[PDB]
Design a protein around this ligand. Structure first.
Ligand SMILES: O=c1ccn([C@@H]2O[C@H](COP(=O)(O)O)[C@@H](O)[C@H]2O)c(=O)[nH]1
Ligand SMILES: [Mn+2]
Ligand SMILES: [Mn+2]
Length: 179
């Protein structure tokens, strides 16, 4: 699986993923499934950000903590939006809301509930994707156009197919744990 992650994800994503894991005392070389998951989430966030018009989104995920909060605090001060308890994935300038992205190896509804439990009374929008073309979003408001969503869903399906071709899918699919 390590060779797979290095092969299918761009180096910027891989480096960010490795850093995140190490910050948690985890070795990307050993907890490979987790390594792949972080990379996948990151790719989706970047793809999602590229989905709208130029300037539509601000990417929060993938930034170091100080920079991430700086962006979030800056957004809150200027737009008047309430400050989230934990870092969100992106900010939508058009809808003026923060977005939390989830990619799940399980089922979208369960993952959405789990995300919602963390967010609570939070006003953050939630968008969940699966590797099998399913998606779930807050108030069924999908934010992006179908073509954009389709590209993400296809890429995820593709990752799944590639993993399966290497016999890595079964382990990967079973490595996601509940809240
Ligand atoms: O402390 C953390 C925070 C996030 N994640 C992982 O980072 C990715 C993105 O998290 P989120 O933006 O969906 O919370 C997911 O694979 C999630 O498990 C962790 O492993 N530990
Ligand atoms: Mn995040
Ligand atoms: Mn996320």
């Amino acid at each position: 699986m390590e060779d797979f992650v290095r092969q299918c994800f761009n180096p910027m994503i891989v480096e960010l993923a490795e850093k995140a894991m190490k910050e948690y005392g985890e070795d990307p070389k050993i907890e490979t499934n987790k390594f792949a998951a972080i990379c996948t989430h990151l790719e989706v966030c970047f793809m999602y950000s590229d989905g709208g018009s130029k300037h539509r989104f601000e990417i929060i995920e993938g930034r170091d903590r100080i920079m991430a909060w700086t962006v979030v605090n800056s957004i809150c001060n200027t737009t008047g939006v309430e400050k989230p308890k934990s870092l969100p994935d992106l900010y939508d300038y058009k809808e003026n809301r923060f977005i939390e992205i989830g990619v799940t190896r399980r089922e979208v509804h369960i993952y959405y509930l789990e995300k919602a439990n963390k967010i609570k009374s939070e006003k953050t929008h939630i968008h969940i994707f699966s590797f099998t073309g399913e998606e779930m979003a807050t108030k069924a408001d999908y934010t992006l156009d179908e073509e954009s969503r389709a590209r993400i869903k296809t890429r995820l399906f593709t990752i799944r197919q590639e993993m399966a071709s290497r016999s890595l899918w079964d382990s990967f699919r079973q490595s996601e744990r509940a809240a």
